[PDB]
Design a protein around this ligand. Sequence first.
Ligand SMILES: [Cl-]
Ligand SMILES: [Cl-]
Length: 162
Amino acid sequence: MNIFEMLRIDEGLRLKIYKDTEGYYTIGIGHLLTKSPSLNAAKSELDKAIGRNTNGVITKDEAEKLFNQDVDAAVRGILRNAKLKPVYDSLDAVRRAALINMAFQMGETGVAGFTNSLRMLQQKRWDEAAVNLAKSRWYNQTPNRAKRVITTFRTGTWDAYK
Ligand SMILES: [Cl-]
Ligand SMILES: [Cl-]
C-alpha cells in the first residue's frame, strides 16, 4: 500500500464529469473541476486541464495524469505550509500518507484548520487525536472515509485499507 493506492480507493475512478459528495463537478480520481453550478463552466475547466476538447470524457491515462499532478501538489502544499510542515516532518511514513489524504480531499487550508488535532498528532497522542479528528463536519459528512483515515493515524498501519 501507498498514497496512490490509498487515495484511489477513497476517491474511485470516473471517466465522465460527475458530482462529488458536496455536489461539485469533478472527474477522474477526485479531481475537482469547479465549485460553479455550471456544467459548461466545468467542461471548460476540464478542457483547459487536459489541453484538448474533451466533451466531458477523458481516458484512463488522462485521469492518471491529473492524479499524479494532484498528489504532487498536495504534498507540496503541506511542505509549504508553516502549520503543516512540522506535523508532516514528525510523522512516520504511514501516517504521512493519512495527512496527504486529508490535504487532497479538503485542501491545505481545510487541513490547517484542525489545529488541535494537528498538535496531538505532533505530540504522538494517537488516541486523543483520533477522538478530536472525529468531532468535525468532515467525519459527519463522509464518515466511512474519515474512519479509514483516522484509523490510519491511530494505528500507523494500513489495516483500514486491507
Ligand atoms: Cl489542473
Ligand atoms: Cl464516506
